[PDB]
Ligand binder design. Structure first.
Ligand code: NAG
Ligand code: 1P8
Ligand code: ZN
Length: 219
């Protein structure tokens, strides 16, 4: 998260920190708990295996709120496209149902000009390392023409997010985190420019609701 502030610890109890294993070292993403055994995230966060940590704030400092949970199966959207980046969404089924605590719970599951918030442990600058702590930033929902320069951007599939006159943005490591507008998840962090100049492109959750529901029922 670039240009954001540190969250009050545990104030976003649905947030998930993902460590993804592959021919290379671990990579990291965000995500969010939508059922006690399901986490929503981005398709580009798929790997050979994934571990989810719930209840975290400072991810380097173990505490009783932590629940480190095995993922049994990844459900990457079958149409996720590495060329166009369309359909960047994935469900992770946890081995067991998470415990509900003050620090861990599910997330109950908009015109441009509206302000939305996104949280994550990703880089706090283009050349800065990932954050030890959960950060959040408020971003402006933009008209789709604001994202025209992303040539494969599609208004039906995606949200255009972030005033270009502000430096505020999600970035590397924030992939998969929710964008909330009035407390409801509307987007998922997907991609943007390598120099972090806003706006960026988020998956429009509403388009994928039938696919999500279908997975939640077959599994
Ligand atoms: C997070 O925890 C580590 C280890 O306890 C500590 O070194 C670091 O300063 C902490 N970061 C913040 C911002 O609290
Ligand atoms: O919003 C985002 C998420 C993201 C991930 C990676 C890169 Br490079 C840029 C961005 N911008
Ligand atoms: Zn704590």
């Amino acid at each position: 998260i670039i240009g954001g502030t540190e969250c009050k610890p545990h104030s976003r109890p649905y947030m998930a920190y993902l460590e993804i294993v592959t021919n290379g070292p671990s990579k990291f993403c965000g995500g969010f708990l939508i059922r006690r055994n399901f986490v929503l995230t981005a398709a580009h966060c798929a790997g050979r295996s994934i571990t989810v940590t719930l209840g975290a704030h400072n991810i380097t400092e173990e505490e009783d709120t932590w629940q480190k949970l095995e993922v049994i199966k990844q459900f990457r959207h079958p149409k996720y496209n590495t060329s166009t980046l369309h359909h960047d969404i994935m469900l992770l089924k946890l081995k067991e149902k998470a415990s509900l605590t003050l620090a861990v719970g599910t997330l109950p599951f908009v015109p441009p000009g509206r302000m939305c918030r996104v949280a994550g442990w990703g880089r706090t600058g283009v050349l800065k390392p990932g954050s030890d702590t959960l950060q959040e930033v408020k971003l402006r929902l933009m008209d789709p023409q604001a994202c025209s320069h992303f040539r494969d951007f599609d208004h039906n599939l995606q949200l255009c997010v972030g005033n270009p006159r502000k430096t505020k943005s999600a970035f590397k490591g924030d992939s998969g985190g929710p964008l909330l507008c009035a407390g409801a998840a509307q987007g998922i962090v997907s991609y943007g420019r390598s120099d972090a100049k806003p706006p960026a492109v988020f998956t429009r959750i509403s388009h994928y609701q039938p696919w999500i529901n279908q997975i939640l029922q077959a599994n």
